[PDB]
């Protein structure tokens, strides 16, 4: 819905949602499963506010404390999946996968953030609503055709997220499958106790 990543926690003890930040400080959720999820955030448009639905870049999403001071580095990163940056020589901007082809960054960074941006409707070109599929972003140049067929095979993606009720490892697409919606909000939440 929305093309939103997932947003947050169900605490199936109180039957009530938390952030992920709070699980994660409540140890309901496992450190490392938590700072991926809010990377998917930062990847997609912005840390979540449950309360309101809206996002916000980490900067402001750290200011307003959605997360801790101790994320805010790493999801700087995985927010130039969003934002796109710009070329040291030609100054133009570029999404991460053509980053990656042009040599400014490791496909081994930006495979997970266009995996979570293909689940959630498609990859992101910079500064544009409506999301590109893969066959598209492959004929363009826009991901190399390793990238498309990682992408593609959505049954092999990294099984790096452990579900807090089952312990099972789950890739983000089984992830995305064990959440609930908010009754309030409509967004995704994964259980957790």
């Given at each position: 819905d929305?093309?939103?990543?997932?947003?947050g926690?169900?605490?199936?003890?109180?039957?009530?949602?938390?952030?992920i930040?709070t699980?994660?400080?409540?140890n309901?959720?496992?450190?490392?499963?938590?700072?991926?999820?809010?990377?998917?955030?930062?990847?997609t448009?912005?840390?979540?506010?449950?309360?309101?639905?809206?996002?916000?870049?980490?900067?402001?999403?750290?200011?307003r404390?959605?997360?801790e001071?101790?994320?805010?580095?790493?999801?700087?990163?995985?927010?130039?999946?969003?934002?796109g940056?710009?070329?040291?020589v030609?100054?133009?901007?570029?999404?991460?996968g053509?980053?990656?082809?042009?040599?400014?960054?490791?496909?081994?960074?930006?495979?997970?953030?266009?995996?979570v941006?293909?689940?959630?409707?498609?990859?992101?070109?910079?500064?544009?609503?409506?999301?590109?599929?893969?066959?598209?972003?492959?004929?363009?140049?826009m991901?190399?055709?390793?990238?498309?067929?990682?992408?593609?095979?959505?049954?092999?993606?990294?099984?790096?997220?452990?579900?807090?009720?089952?312990?099972?490892?789950?890739?983000?697409?089984?992830?995305?499958?064990?959440?609930?919606?908010?009754?309030?909000?409509?967004?995704?939440?994964?259980?957790?106790?």
């Amino acid at each position: 819905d929305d093309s939103f990543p997932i947003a947050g926690i169900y605490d199936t003890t109180t039957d009530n949602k938390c952030s992920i930040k709070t699980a994660v400080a409540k140890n309901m959720l496992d450190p490392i499963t938590g700072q991926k999820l809010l990377e998917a955030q930062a990847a997609t448009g912005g840390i979540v506010d449950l309360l309101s639905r809206e996002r916000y870049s980490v900067h402001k999403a750290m200011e307003r404390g959605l997360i801790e001071n101790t994320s805010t580095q790493r999801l700087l990163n995985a927010q130039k999946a969003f934002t796109g940056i710009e070329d040291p020589v030609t100054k133009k901007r570029l999404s991460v996968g053509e980053a990656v082809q042009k040599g400014w960054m490791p496909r081994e960074s930006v495979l997970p953030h266009l995996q979570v941006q293909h689940l959630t409707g498609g990859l992101i070109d910079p500064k544009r609503t409506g999301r590109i599929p893969i066959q598209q972003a492959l004929l363009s140049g826009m991901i190399s055709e390793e990238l498309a067929q990682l992408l593609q095979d959505e049954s092999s993606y990294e099984k790096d997220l452990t579900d807090p009720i089952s312990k099972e490892r789950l890739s983000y697409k089984e992830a995305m499958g064990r959440c609930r919606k908010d009754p309030l909000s409509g967004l995704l939440l994964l259980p957790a106790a």
